[PDB]
Amino acid sequence: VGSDPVILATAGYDHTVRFWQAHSGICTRTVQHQDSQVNALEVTPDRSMIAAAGYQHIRMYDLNSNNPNPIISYDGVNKNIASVGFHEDGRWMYTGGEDCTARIWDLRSRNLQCQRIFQVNAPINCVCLHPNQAELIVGDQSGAIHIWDLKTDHNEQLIPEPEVSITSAHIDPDASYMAAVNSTGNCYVWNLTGGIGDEVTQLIPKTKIPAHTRYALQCRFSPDSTLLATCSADQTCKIWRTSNFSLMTELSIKSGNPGESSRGWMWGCAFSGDSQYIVTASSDNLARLWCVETGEIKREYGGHQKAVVCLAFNDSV
Amino acid sequence: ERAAKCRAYAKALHYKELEFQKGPTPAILESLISINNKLQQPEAAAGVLEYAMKHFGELEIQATWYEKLHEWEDALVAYDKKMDTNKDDPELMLGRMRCLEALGEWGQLHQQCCEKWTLVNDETQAKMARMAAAAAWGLGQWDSMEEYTCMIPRDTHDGAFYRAVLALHQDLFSLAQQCIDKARDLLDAELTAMAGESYSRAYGAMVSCHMLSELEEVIQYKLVPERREIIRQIWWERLQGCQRIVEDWQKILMVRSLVVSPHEDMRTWLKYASLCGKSGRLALAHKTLVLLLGVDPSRQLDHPLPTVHPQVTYAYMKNMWKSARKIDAFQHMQHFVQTMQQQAQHAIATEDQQHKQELHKLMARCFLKLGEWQLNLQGINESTIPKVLQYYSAATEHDRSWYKAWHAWAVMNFEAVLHYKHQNQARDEKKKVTEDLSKTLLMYTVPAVQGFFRSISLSRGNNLQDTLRVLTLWFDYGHWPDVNEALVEGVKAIQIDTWLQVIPQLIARIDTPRPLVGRLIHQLLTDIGRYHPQALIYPLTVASKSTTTARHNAANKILKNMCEHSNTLVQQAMMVSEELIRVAILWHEMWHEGLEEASRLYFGERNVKGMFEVLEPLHAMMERGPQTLKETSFNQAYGRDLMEAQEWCRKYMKSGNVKDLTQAWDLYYHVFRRISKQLPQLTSLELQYVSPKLLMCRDLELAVPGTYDPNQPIIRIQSIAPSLQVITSKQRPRKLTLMGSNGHEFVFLLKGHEDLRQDERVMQLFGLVNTLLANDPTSLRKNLSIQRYAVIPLSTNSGLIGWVPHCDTLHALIRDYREKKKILLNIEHRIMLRMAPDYDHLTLMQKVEVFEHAVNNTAGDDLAKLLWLKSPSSEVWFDRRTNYTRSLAVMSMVGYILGLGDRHPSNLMLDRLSGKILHIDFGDCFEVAMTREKFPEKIPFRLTRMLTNAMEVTGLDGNYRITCHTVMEVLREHKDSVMAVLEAFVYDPLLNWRLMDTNTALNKKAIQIINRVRDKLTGRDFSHDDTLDVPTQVELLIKQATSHENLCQCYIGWCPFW
């Protein structure tokens, strides 16, 4: 299950976290995740185990022991835990809670306590880690994007348009582009000054994309740094060209007649390694595999009783 | 026939709106403003235009929207932009002109007519003439008028009218006489041609009909010399009385202008200019006064103002202030007063007393303004304080009477007091200090008191603010002899009446430890006992049964004192209130809660010292022996068990066992199960078992709880209804019902365990807000009020509540509709749980979806739809809506100021007969609801979806919002009276408990709450730094009350989907 070359995980309000086999749509194993919905799934760079960020806890089941139950729980933190991110070298983990804190977790040690805390006014919706492992990007509900220097502990903030909560933020593998998506439905792109190693690492605004009319729920760069994906409450994942910042492929689950009242929000997405494919999480209880280029629904992973909010995807050797 | 014509229009509007429901089109939108116009509903329709704008910029030209929005001044400079950017465009001129003729800009209208006369367009030639005729009429030039009148057809009412004016100038009387009647019949047949679907031209026909009969008095004022007083009187009365927006009155005076020059009318034109300034047409008002002055729009700007007409100058002065130039205004005032006092002292040769007097009163108005403005320019500090006090005292001198003068002076002293106090607490944060402070405060406290006293006597029946303020100084100054004498003087001086407004505040301070303070209270309270007891007993009765000794003690003296004077009334009231508290929580009912509590402390907390405290009074309570049949029938079935259950408890106290103690709980769980069974069997109480004393009561002299007011014949309890329905609830309240000695029936709600004293003060605040609303003309125009009810506390536990007739809770009205239409009551709820089982724990983002999803799969009609099915007609239906919307908007704004939380569907109800809304239960006041730990409110007032629906479509745009700023306007104006009341029960000694519930000294906490209230009354509620004007604040608020983000967080019982 962590032994198959392609890990695909799906979670939501149905108290399970389900694992699928990429190329067929057949569900491998399912694990019990009761007492909470699942807010975020992320598979550790180590391919050993997956993380389920929930309500006041982060449960972590194992991809290797192919059976049991949560290896580690992390408790003693009130309100939801919204984002999870790991640091390449095994033992680091990050979270942004509704408790307005960004927390650094030592994985190779005991304590429900965390090695560090960064605290802001307003809940933290997303946390992502600059490729250089040295800076953390933190976006909160007030609309501020924080750069936390993991060495200098130097808080440095930046609000774009916001008096609007920024929803997710991502930064491309090449460290050339950072993107943040907000609840208005906008997508902001910056150019990265690669200060690094004796650091400066600055942000120069490049574009605002009118990505969506409704809540924009997540954004993600393809491994390529070719494309940028935008998931939204308008039941749509929009894939944009980094060269033009023009729309390339739109994916949607919008009924087929105005009198349907939607059914399904496009909660999350995850590109394939080769950046050829994209996976999709929806409230209509299904994950979806799309061809990035044709926008073709190549598979439909149906199984969850209640909604899906969570994806995890892995492509490593 | 006439009452039958509006009926069809109302019924068509229903379907017309339900069509707009189906698809919002400009087609319907047209046939909607129009039909609402016929229904002479002006503002509701105006809301149709707000929507028309916000979704269709499509009858185009932002100058056409500004013109239809009667914003002439906005449409003018929009048309200037539109004409100078574009070309000639025949239509763009006609609009540019209409703006002028409404603004009364005859200067430009006449010019724009002549200076542009190519007008090859012949329709452009036809309208043209009507406008330039009046323009010339406004500018004297009768030649131009006649020229342009010769172009108006005699077929038009207009053509026949302007002939009547030109005749009357050249003195051709029987010409004008006939011109009047022709134009009448040309307009009579014209109000039948545009039969219903016309402009404010059936409302502006009253402008023409007025003008025509007035023009017939202008006739009367030409040949026969003997109505020069009679005509001027009616002209004058039907003016201060009459209410027609600026623009009509211009024309109206222009008719009177043929007959009387402004310099003989003066008072008339000043009154008119007065309205132009208040309504916000200063540029116009200025021109009125410049004429009246006979001197410059002070183009000679560095020059002194002319004292020629002392009255006119004063107006110009305050127009200049209200205008931009306000440092310039203040300067001309200082000098004006200096000139005025010299024009008095020296220029008064005795046989000139009237002029001296009117001169002296105008002066007092000046000093008032001088102080007002100094405060405005500099604020309150060590340099301004004595200067404005100097100004106010001076105003006090020159008018002696006049409420405002004395008031202003009191507040100044009282804010002088406050300034130093708040500077000294500022000092203390970082012995000769206290002594100078003592002398400082004593210097300002005594005038403050005195002033407030002479102000109150000048207010009579309208002094609540001042009266409370007297109390702040009284209560707040642990009394120094100097202050006390001033108080004693006032007490003797001012009427007894006054204090009734204030009785609960007074009683909150009976047990005052400050000895000089206490005496006066007691003595005054007894005097208030001498004239109108009744107004005293109920409250005093509560106080005289009070755990706190000094309270009940001092209360009993006053009652004793009242017996030497009104004994049986004291005795009657004594017993009635006693009996009623027995009926509120019955023996077994007290036992049940007591047994629940005792099982929590012991079995679930290991606390026997708390548990014993729970049970011991219940045992002592019955130790007194049964007193009613209901008390004995409990005593039989349960008494022996309990009396021996306490026996085991008291074997353990001395033994310290646990087997002694478990025998007790063995017995305790027995009766509990028995009572729990009989509990849903309490659906009625018969008086003859429960309280025979109350069944006995016949033709008492005690007045029906909360009916007594002087002015009004005392309504007494002539009998009590023998059965009290038990409203089956968690607190099972009683539907006590009483018989009036006037015949009518009075219903109450006997509440067992809720401290009702808060709701009293809330109802008190309301009364004031009602007054204020009745006193603002606009609010009075639209019948804006708070549906209030009687609240009579009976202890800390119990009390009575006035039962408004014809009212069902929102919740009830829905539960019926839903069961009648076969909808599962809690359908939205069930939808949500099916989708997200862990709803209460989702992220905001996730919650908003679950919520939205539930809304999109349910009818928002319900409320709207059942109020249409209820209505017997359609006009009835319409008014019930107009009522509902307005009344709700009122308590949206007031509710906000009071910080009124917990507005769930069983806490507001609707009067099924008028439609006016009604709020009950005022526990969660001030931000409390929002401050709580679990499930904090994010809402200012419920503006929930089925409420909105039930209004007119284009709801919040129409009546709701207008009514919102209208109410909010009043509140900010009267921000101080409103703050007096609120301050009075935030710092009320006994009521401070509702703020220490932030846990599940106070001095600091209380201050915040009150600032928070001021913030809300000074547009600083949102951002600290900005000072939002009303409509913005309003807009911001409606936004906050509507945010799905806010509503999805509301605890499920609040029904954020109803």
Ligand SMILES: Oc1cccc(-c2nc(N3CCOCC3)c3oc4ncccc4c3n2)c1
């Ligand atoms: O101020 C409070 C505090 C607590 C409860 C109530 C209250 N008021 C009610 N109305 C007062 C206004 O006119 C109609 C009756 C009221 O009517 C009710 N009907 C059933 C149960 C409770 C109540 C109830 N509770 C009022």
